[PDB]
Every structure is written in C-alpha cells, then in structure tokens.
Amino acid sequence: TLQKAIDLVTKATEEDKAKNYEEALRLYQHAVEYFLHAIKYEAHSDKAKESIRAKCVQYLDRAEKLKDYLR
C-alpha cells in the first residue's frame, strides 16, 4: 500500500504540471485515499502519523481545486 500511495500521488503531481487536472485528480484522490487507509490499518506513532496526515490534508485540498477547475 505504501508504494501504491506514493506511486499514485507521484503520477498526480506530474499530471498537474502537464496541464492535466483530470488525470492529476484521479491520481491524487487515489493516493491520499490509499494513504489514509494505511494509517488506520498500520502506523508508527503520533509524530509519524502527523507527517502523513499533513501531507494528505494538503493533497486533498489540491484535488477539490482540480475537479472544480474543470467542473
């Protein structure tokens, strides 16, 4: 799930750079969604969970901004 979480967000970032909000959104929601599921299942501590949460919360905001841009 870790690789899928990173590989997903990684593809979303590149997409956003190539004027691909659509492909970037699907990859973003897929990455963040997989990240959260990984935390609820397994985690290290509040510290680590925080770093993963902040990165997810920020990624989620960008998603809604993309879907809204085209919508």
């Binding site: 959104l25 963040v32 959260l36 609820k40 949460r53 998603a63």
Partner: peptide
C-alpha cells in the same frame, strides 16, 4: 484525519 478522510470519500464517490 476524519476531516480529510470524509471529504476524500465524497470525491471518489
């Protein structure tokens, strides 16, 4: 976590 977790679930669905 529930904040973004909820808004995220709505995005996909």
């Amino acid at each position: 976590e529930d904040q973004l977790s909820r808004r995220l679930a709505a995005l996909r669905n």
